[PDB]
C-alpha cells in the first residue's frame, strides 16, 4: 500500500480483446 | 462434495466386490460342509450376508460420508453373482462330502 511497491510493465490459439456482450 | 474423483469410488467398488465375492464363496463352502439342504440353507446365506455388512460398518466406522454417499450400496450391493457362487460351492461341497 505504501513505500514498498514495485510495478513491472512491458498468438496462443484463441486471443480476442473486445465486446461480445 | 462439489468435486468427485473417479479413482477413489472405483477403488471402493473394487474393495466391496472383493469382500462380497470372497464371503459368498466361503459361506457357500461352509453351508455345504454343514450338510444343510433346501430353502433352510438359503436362510443361512442371508444371515451370512448380514454379517458381512455388519463388519463393513466396523471397517467404515464413523465419518462414512467421506467414502460413500449412502449406506444402501454398502448393504444391498452385489446380491446376484454372490448367490451364484454360493450355490455353486454349496453343490460342489455337498456332493463332495455327503454323497459317496
Amino acid at each position: 500500500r505504501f513505500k514498498w511497491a514495485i510495478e513491472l510493465s512491458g498468438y496462443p490459439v484463441g486471443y480476442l480483446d473486445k465486446q461480445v456482450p | 462434495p462439489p468435486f468427485i474423483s473417479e479413482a477413489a469410488v472405483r477403488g471402493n467398488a473394487a474393495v466391496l466386490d472383493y469382500c462380497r465375492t470372497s464371503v459368498s464363496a466361503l459361506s457357500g463352502a461352509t453351508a455345504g460342509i454343514l450338510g444343510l439342504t433346501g430353502l433352510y440353507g438359503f436362510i443361512f446365506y442371508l444371515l451370512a450376508s448380514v454379517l458381512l455388512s455388519l463388519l463393513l460398518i466396523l471397517k467404515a466406522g464413523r465419518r462414512w460420508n467421506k467414502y460413500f454417499k449412502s449406506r444402501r450400496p454398502l448393504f444391498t450391493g452385489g446380491l446376484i453373482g454372490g448367490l451364484f457362487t454360493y450355490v455353486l460351492f454349496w453343490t460342489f461341497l455337498y456332493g463332495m462330502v455327503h454323497v459317496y
Binding site: 513491472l8 490459439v13 | 468435486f3
Partner: protein, 291 residues
C-alpha cells in the same frame, strides 16, 4: 545408507524412490545416494523394478555432475533394451549435458524421422533452444508444438512460465486460464493466476485478483499466500481514489476480516512452537497498513 544414519529395509527405499518419482522432486543428491546403493547391493532383489530406477538415477546423476554412474546406467539400459527410443532420448540428454548440441539435434531428428508422432524429441529440441538463451525461438517452437499437440498441461505451464519471465502477463494469464479450466479443483493454479492478475494492471485486474484469491482460499483453508494476497488486494482497492463508496466499504470489511484471520493464524502458530517473534511483528504490519 542402511545401518548408516538410518535403519530401513530395501522395500522402504523402493517406496521412497517411488514417492519421489510420483511428485516431481529434484533433490538430485539424495536420489543419487539412495539409487546407487539400491543398484549395487540389491540388484537381484528387485525382480523387474530396476529399469525405472536406472532411468531416474541416470537423470539425477546428470543433474549432480557425476557422469560415471550415468554412463554405467545408460550402458545397462542400452544392453537390456536394444533399439529402444527412450534410451536414445537419454543418450541425447547425456550428449547435451556436455555442451554437444549438434549431435543431440541430429539424434532427435533421426528419432523423429523414424517415428513422426513422437513427443519427447520435440520437447528436448525446445530444451536445447532454451539452454542457449534463445528465448524467442523457444517460445515460437513451443507455440507451434502446442498448436500441433493440444491438451498437454506441462507445455502450457512451461509456456506460462516463459511468458512470465519476459514480463508479458496477458498471455501468461491466458495460459493459466487454460490450465485452470482443466483442473478446477487445484488451488495452486488459482493462486498463481491471482498473482499474475495482481501484477498485471489496475482496478479491475485487482478485483479479479481478489476474487481468485478468495476462491483459492475457499478451496484450501491452509493457503497463507492466498490470505496475504487477499488482504493486500482488499487494502489496495479500498484506498484507490477512483472507487465508489460501496466498493470502498466492502473492501474495508474484507481487509478487516482478512487481518483478523491472519492474527488468529499467527496466534495458533505461536501457541505450538515458542518463538514469539512474528506475532509481535505481524501485528505491527497490520496496524501500520490499516485503512
Amino acid at each position: 545408507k542402511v545401518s548408516e544414519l538410518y535403519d530401513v529395509t530395501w522395500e522402504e527405499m523402493r517406496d521412497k524412490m517411488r514417492k519421489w518419482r510420483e511428485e516431481n522432486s529434484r533433490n538430485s543428491e539424495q536420489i543419487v545416494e539412495v539409487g546407487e546403493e539400491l543398484i549395487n547391493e540389491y540388484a537381484s532383489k528387485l525382480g523387474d523394478d530396476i529399469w525405472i530406477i536406472y532411468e531416474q538415477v541416470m537423470i539425477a546423476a546428470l543433474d549432480y555432475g557425476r557422469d560415471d554412474l550415468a554412463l554405467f546406467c545408460l550402458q545397462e539400459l542400452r544392453r537390456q533394451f536394444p533399439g529402444s527410443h527412450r534410451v536414445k532420448r537419454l543418450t541425447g540428454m547425456r550428449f547435451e549435458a556436455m555442451e554437444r548440441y549438434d549431435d543431440a539435434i541430429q539424434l532427435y531428428d533421426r528419432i523423429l524421422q523414424e517415428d513422426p508422432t513422437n513427443t519427447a524429441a520435440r520437447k528436448r529440441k525446445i530444451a536445447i533452444r532454451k539452454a542457449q538463451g534463445k528465448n524467442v525461438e523457444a517460445i515460437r517452437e513451443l507455440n507451434e508444438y502446442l498448436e500441433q499437440f493440444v491438451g498437454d498441461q506441462e507445455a502450457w505451464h512451461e509456456l506460462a512460465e516463459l511468458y512470465i519471465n519476459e514480463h508479458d502477463y496477458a498471455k501468461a494469464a491466458f495460459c493459466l486460464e487454460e490450465l485452470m479450466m482443466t483442473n478446477p479443483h487445484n488451488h495452486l493454479y488459482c493462486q498463481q493466476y491471482a498473482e499474475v492478475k495482481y501484477t498485471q494492471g489496475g482496478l479491475e485486474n485487482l478485483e479479479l485478483s481478489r476474487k481468485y484469491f478468495a476462491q483459492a482460499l475457499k478451496l484450501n483453508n491452509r493457503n497463507m499466500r492466498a490470505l496475504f494476497g487477499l488482504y493486500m488486494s482488499a487494502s489496495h482497492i479500498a484506498s484507490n481514489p477512483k472507487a465508489s463508496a460501496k466498493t470502498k466499504k466492502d473492501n474495508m470489511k474484507y481487509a478487516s476480516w482478512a487481518a483478523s484471520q491472519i492474527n488468529r493464524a499467527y496466534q495458533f502458530a505461536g501457541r505450538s512452537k515458542k518463538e514469539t517473534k512474528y506475532s509481535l511483528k505481524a501485528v505491527e504490519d497490520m496496524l501500520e497498513t490499516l485503512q
